[PDB]
Amino acid sequence: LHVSAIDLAKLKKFIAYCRVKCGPRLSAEAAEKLKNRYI
Amino acid sequence: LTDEDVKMITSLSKDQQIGEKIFASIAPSIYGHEDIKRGLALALFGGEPKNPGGKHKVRGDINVLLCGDPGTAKSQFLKYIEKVSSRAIFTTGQGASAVGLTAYVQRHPVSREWTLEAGALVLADRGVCLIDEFDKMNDQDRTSIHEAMEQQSISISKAGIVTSLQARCTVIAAANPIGGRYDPSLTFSENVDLTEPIISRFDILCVVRDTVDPVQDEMLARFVVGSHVRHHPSNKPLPQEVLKKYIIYAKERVHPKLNQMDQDKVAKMYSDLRKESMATGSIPITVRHIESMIRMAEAHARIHLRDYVIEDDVNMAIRVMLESFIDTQKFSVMRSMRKTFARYLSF
Ligand SMILES: Nc1ncnc2c1ncn2[C@@H]1O[C@H](COP(=O)(O)OP(=O)(O)OP(=O)(O)O)[C@@H](O)[C@H]1O
Ligand SMILES: [Mg+2]
């Protein structure tokens, strides 16, 4: 690092983009698997 | 700023004893503490700041803490640094400070205009804040100095001023250990009242013990009385401003680069040091220390006015960093590390 010294702006923009655009909300099969591994 | 400065500084830089000439030109009104003269030289000239990408804050400022039992020229050192280094200010943990560590906005009295009095560090943004009696600063100043040397930006949010003034401080500090006397049995951290994260990031820790000794006390007393008789009102190394022109020249114009050091040697160095330090109650050398080692290397290359760091510079930076680490370490482990690593401290 000392000698050498996607992109940051692109990544933060992409972060805001995902957060504003999509609402992820799991499916029932995933919920049941999580139930089993939760117990 | 001036011209012929390049001529004089390079002409003397040819000499190649310039490192020791600087070490003996720093702090001539003090006796002994050659380790701290050298260490403050490395702090004064600093390293380099870099940012691989826009993602990693690696700094060029070498921060120093003297910890000393009383009456051993800590404030004398600090006032020398204030005198010599441009963009220096002084401040104290106590309330008698000329300039304060915290940032505040008010109506400044002598002008009665509503200033943003940004604190001591920000006012010393390029160069040095000097914290005398670093061991008693109020908890607000603890918060502020911690956030300064960690973030390197002071985040003010008082009235409506929700801003962040950048503070690229190069903090020097002085601290009196608990009980007014250094205790070699306990470690540095637990015999100085500075908490772990604060004591960590200081690039140099130095210990100042006032060990009674015949020849030492004779020398010190003769020096002091000589100064006194010389400073009666009847009698009314390089010069300091020469050193200051050297300081700015080698601090801004010269950026020594590093592809010319035994990468494998230093990697195995960290390996061996940490491998020995593997133990309980033995908080080891880490990457903090290895980057401090590179900072010190760059600083010695700066000090030599070179444009390329050399094995000689790497040896000196190794020497000072390892000296600081062992003297941080308590007595028995200190002697173990000193005995097994004398080869580097030999140089
Ligand atoms: N090595 C030394 N060389 C010259 N003077 C010294 C030395 N050690 C101590 N003194 C003298 O000791 C007196 C006290 O110095 P200084 O102001 O540094 O105190 P201190 O040890 O930092 O104490 P405190 O914790 O109260 O700040 C000064 O006169 C200083 O000249
Ligand atoms: Mg003092």
Side-chain angles (χ1 to χ4, degrees), chain B residues 74-75 132-133 176:
Chain B
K74 301 205 287 287
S75 306
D132 202 318
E133 302 292 351
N176 290 306

Side-chain angles (χ1 to χ4, degrees), chain B residues 119-162:
Chain B
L121 300 109
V122 286
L123 293 162
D125 173 281
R126 307 191 189 165
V128 293
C129 173
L130 312 176
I131 311 162
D132 202 318
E133 302 292 351
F134 186 86
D135 56 3
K136 180 45 71 182
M137 53 174 170
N138 193 217
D139 83 86
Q140 291 82 329
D141 288 41
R142 293 197 198 284
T143 281
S144 287
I145 199 79
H146 167 222
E147 197 180 14
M149 286 175 297
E150 209 172 11
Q151 288 252 230
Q152 215 153 22
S153 70
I154 286 164
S155 183
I156 302 165
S157 148
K158 296 314 305 175
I161 312 184
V162 293

Side-chain angles (χ1 to χ4, degrees), chain B residues 62-81:
Chain B
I62 276 152
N63 299 258
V64 174
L65 181 79
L66 282 76
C67 189
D69 52 6
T72 61
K74 301 205 287 287
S75 306
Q76 190 88 233
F77 261 108
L78 260 59
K79 293 306 197 315
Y80 185 85
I81 304 311

Side-chain angles (χ1 to χ4, degrees), chain B residues 161-324:
Chain B
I161 312 184
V162 293
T163 185
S164 303
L165 273 65
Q166 178 142 7
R168 307 183 298 267
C169 64
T170 61
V171 168
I172 314 311
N176 290 306
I178 192 173
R181 197 77 182 174
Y182 200 77
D183 198 326
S185 68
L186 267 53
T187 43
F188 198 106
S189 307
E190 70 202 330
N191 87 76
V192 76
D193 274 27
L194 312 172
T195 176
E196 286 189 23
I198 297 165
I199 182 61
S200 295
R201 63 192 63 96
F202 288 108
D203 273 25
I204 320 186
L205 309 182
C206 303
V207 163
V208 171
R209 293 200 310 276
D210 195 344
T211 51
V212 58
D213 168 280
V215 289
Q216 193 207 335
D217 294 319
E218 170 52 30
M219 296 149 85
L220 206 160
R222 196 159 64 192
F223 179 31
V224 172
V225 67
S227 80
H228 272 279
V229 64
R230 180 54 50 191
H231 298 169
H232 192 287
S234 164
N235 306 331
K236 52 169 279 179
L238 284 65
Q240 314 317 294
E241 308 315 314
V242 174
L243 176 67
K244 195 165 186 149
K245 305 325 188 199
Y246 198 114
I247 276 166
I248 289 298
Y249 190 7
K251 182 167 182 300
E252 299 295 347
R253 318 305 184 74
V254 173
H255 279 45
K257 304 188 166 189
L258 77 186
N259 325 310
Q260 296 78 16
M261 57 181 273
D262 294 356
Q263 152 76 107
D264 299 337
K265 185 189 283 172
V266 296
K268 295 182 177 182
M269 198 56 41
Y270 176 41
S271 94
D272 184 2
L273 264 288
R274 200 195 161 72
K275 187 173 174 193
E276 174 160 358
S277 172
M278 283 167 192
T280 190
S282 308
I283 314 301
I285 214 170
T286 77
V287 178
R288 271 171 176 164
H289 302 67
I290 304 303
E291 69 174 36
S292 297
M293 165 49 214
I294 318 310
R295 267 166 221 159
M296 294 166 189
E298 261 192 345
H300 209 243
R302 267 194 194 283
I303 281 158
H304 276 268
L305 191 76
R306 197 155 290 165
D307 300 292
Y308 264 108
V309 52
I310 305 300
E311 194 69 8
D312 204 73
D313 307 352
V314 172
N315 271 24
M316 279 272 173
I318 287 283
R319 157 167 155 192
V320 305
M321 211 288 281
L322 271 290
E323 280 163 305
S324 160

